[PDB]
A paper describes a structure:
Intriguingly, it was recently reported that the central ZZ-domain in p62 plays a critical role in the recognition of N-terminal arginylated BiP/GRP78 by the Arg-tRNA transferase ATE1.
As described for the R-BiP complex, two aspartic acid residues, Asp129 and Asp149, bind to the α-amino group, and Asp147 forms a hydrogen bond with the first peptide bond, which means that these interactions are conserved in all different N-terminal residues. As expected, arginine at the primary position showed the strongest binding affinity with, intriguingly, tyrosine and tryptophan residues following in second and third place, respectively. Our structural and biochemical measurement data showed that the presence of tyrosine or tryptophan at the primary position resulted in relatively high affinity because these side chains contain polar atoms, oxygen in tyrosine and nitrogen in tryptophan that can form hydrogen bonds with the side chain of Asn132 of the ZZ-domain.
Author numbering: -3 to 45
Amino acid sequence: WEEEDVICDGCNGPVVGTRYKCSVCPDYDLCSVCEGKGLHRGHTKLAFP
Ligand SMILES: [Zn+2]
Ligand SMILES: [Zn+2]
């Protein structure tokens, strides 16, 4: 029962719904809100659920 949860690197809450993971940074993720706020805007991101 090893589980991987995804925490937003902005609000530090878990990412539920759309996940914006950085394509450059290893293991960097933002939630839909923090993405909307323009965080980490210098790196390309992958927007999957
Ligand atoms: Zn967030
Ligand atoms: Zn980045």
